[PDB]
Amino acid sequence: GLTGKLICQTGIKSDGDVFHELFGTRPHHVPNITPANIQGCDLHEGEFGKVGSVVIWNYSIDGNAMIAKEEIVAIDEEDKSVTFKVVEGHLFEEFKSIVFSVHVDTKGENLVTWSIDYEKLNESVKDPTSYLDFLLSVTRDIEAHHLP
Known part of the structure; x- marks a missing residue:
């Protein structure tokens, strides 16, 4: 009853490998490229670019500042x-x-896919569709930054 999945896919005209490695080896640069959405990314444990690292995101949705500690x-x-x-x-x-998962397909002629898999604490909890708007805004900012 409490489980859902949300997915958004959009094209980017920038380099897809650079987009992938931004999240996979340089996630601490993301605040610098989309500062209206993401104000901080701090290493908590491990090392950037390694599975099992733990980072702290400082981010904002609708003017409200929030924090997410995440394990890669x-x-x-x-x-x-x-x-x-x-x-x-x-x-x-x-x-x-x-x-949250971000996948890049460069095989066609590039697609960024964000997936959100979640289990609500209860049935009154809203599905987190606002986080797709947020991830699309992040993606658009990254594309614009990586384009000549």
């Missing part, structure tokens, strides 16, 4: 994907679990 649970070079599991923060006021 997967970095797949072959699939150009990175998977972030929330382990603490504002989201845990609504969800038992919530995992």
Whole structure:
């Protein structure tokens, strides 16, 4: 009853490998490129670019500042994907679990796919569609930054 998945896909005209490695090896640069959405990214544990690292995101939706501590649970070079599991923060006021994944397909003529997998604390919790608007805004800012 409490489980859902939200996905958004959009094209980018910028380099897809650079987009993938931004999230997979340089996630601390993301605040600098989309500062209206993401104000901070601090290493909590481990090292940037390694599975099992833990980062703290300081970010904002609708003017409201929030915090998500996330474990990087997967970095797949072959699939150009990175998977972030929330382990603490504002989201845990609504969800038992919530995992964000970003995948880039460069095989066609580039697609960014964000997935949100989650389990609500109860049925009155809203599905987190606002986070797709947020991830699309982040993606548009990154594309614009990486374009000549």
